[PDB]
Enzyme design. Sequence first.
Site, PDB file in Angstrom:
ATOM      1  N   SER A 262       2.506   0.739  15.132  1.00  0.00           N
ATOM      2  CA  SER A 262       2.894   1.896  15.739  1.00  0.00           C
ATOM      3  C   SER A 262       3.672   1.597  17.181  1.00  0.00           C
ATOM      4  CB  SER A 262       1.423   2.852  15.985  1.00  0.00           C
ATOM      5  OG  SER A 262       2.303   4.142  16.007  1.00  0.00           O
TER       6      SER A 262
ATOM      7  N   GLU B 142       1.922   7.666   5.249  1.00  0.00           N
ATOM      8  CA  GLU B 142       2.128   7.339   6.727  1.00  0.00           C
ATOM      9  C   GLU B 142       1.970   8.908   7.466  1.00  0.00           C
ATOM     10  OE1 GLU B 142       2.726   4.979   9.175  1.00  0.00           O
ATOM     11  OE2 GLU B 142       3.179   3.386   8.066  1.00  0.00           O
TER      12      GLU B 142
ATOM     13  N   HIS C 127      -0.975   6.395   8.262  1.00  0.00           N
ATOM     14  CA  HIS C 127      -0.836   5.442   9.612  1.00  0.00           C
ATOM     15  C   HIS C 127      -1.952   5.189  10.361  1.00  0.00           C
ATOM     16  CE1 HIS C 127       1.921   4.500  12.848  1.00  0.00           C
ATOM     17  NE2 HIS C 127       1.101   5.342  13.914  1.00  0.00           N
TER      18      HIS C 127
END
Length: 566
Positions: A214, A347, A467
């Site tokens: 990230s 995600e 994610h």
Amino acid sequence: VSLMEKLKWKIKCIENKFLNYRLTTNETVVAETEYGKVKGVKRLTVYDDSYYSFEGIPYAQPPVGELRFKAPQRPTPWAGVRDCCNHKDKSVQVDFITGKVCGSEDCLYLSVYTNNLNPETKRPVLVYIHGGDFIIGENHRDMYGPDYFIKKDVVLINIQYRLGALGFLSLNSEDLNVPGNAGLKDQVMALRWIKNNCANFGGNPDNITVFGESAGAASTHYMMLTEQTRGLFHRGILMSGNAICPWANTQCQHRAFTLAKLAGYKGEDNDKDVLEFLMKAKPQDLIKLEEKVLTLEERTNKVMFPFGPTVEPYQTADCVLPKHPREMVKTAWGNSIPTMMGNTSYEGLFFTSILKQMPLLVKELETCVNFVPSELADAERTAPETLEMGAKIKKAHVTGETPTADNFMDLCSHFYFWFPMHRLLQLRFNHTSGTPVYLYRFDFDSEDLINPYRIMRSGRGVKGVSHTDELTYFFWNQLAKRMPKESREYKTIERMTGIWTQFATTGNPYSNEIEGMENVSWDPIEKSDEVYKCLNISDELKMIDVPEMGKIKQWESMFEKHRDLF
């Protein structure tokens, strides 16, 4: 976060102290650094492995007083043995569970781990830059435990860096020396330290790999783009992010005034008076008010956070980003090192929580105009070209007459991750030759082993690979447990740490000592490829055409009449 989740968490913090004490041994050891001697301690894992832990190694001066908001300065050496048997504090932030500010301005530390201080040959060094959207995160082993990677014969290093306004304030006034990007400069200084001290812990200074997830992926990418770090390392891995994601860059120069006004500043808007007020404020006040900085128009345009990586408005000896990230990619030294990129299989499932609290966000898919890249969209997002571009996104993601929650999360995977990855690969391919890039898709779902981001995204019970879901198989965290060796979870830990360790070693992530990877062969992406191929990682390890490809092309078709911006 619920009071129930707050109690569970507190209980887990308490359990964790006890687990940590049980796992600590009486074997201490001293190692040398350019700056003095440090004392570490050997620790065990719940798999009965053992490693030497050194935490709290400063790589810069504490950025307090007149150093607040400035580029980090080298740390002052010591004689004697600095105690590195304990962790240091995290960067000032709002705790994701309790919603109280925690941490300290004194947070410029890194932690060094390895199963063996005197190996027979210098080992590959892997440097983890943590995510947290430039506003949260830490190198504490309750969320980033080295327990799994230390099965492998590597040196693992986990850094901290300044977050939020304290890491990312930027002011146009040249006299003030607050150009921006302090937190990324923290990163550079840490990578300088590692370069020059990794050998003292058995590490090979000519084989360093930097990796991150990230905002840590954006950070790693930035470390591959800036001239400040040319040649410092040899591989990079970008996990669910890069420096040209729309969330990874912001022009935040006008926002320091807003922050000061939120904190009580009385006076006119100039940079000097604004900085003087901010230099004296209590740090937790700044960080606490930061969530109120962005305007309604900014949020609607999807600006994710008030302070982050920026284009520095003037040059300095320590400048990290002198131009836009796209322009930086064109001349990046790091274009010439072996590189691996990837994303998870769903995600945008991450945003479930935000959808819960703002169900009306789904209606943004009626035209999708708010998701058109801001460089192409008009200000009010009412131009006919903007409605047309929105229609491309809508046709790609809205599956029935009326948009759903899933269509919204699926579109998010693309806006936030797959589309910027595609832009990057093509941009890179035109400003480099030769050096390979490899793709992975992380597609292994379990709720038997989790990490704390699941509590944050309110994803208990939720199917699909969000994610952050992969972090669980790389790092120990205080919600984890010993899994059976035959468990699918355990096998995924070995596959993940194994592949990452292989790539770090040779710059090629293929190996046939990894189970499931016997009818595999993992080719890098070529400039001529019309469809990307990745190693899809689920219960099976398998090369496939990237399933997201069709949608990726549709997003690309928004630039039909503006090819120079793509």
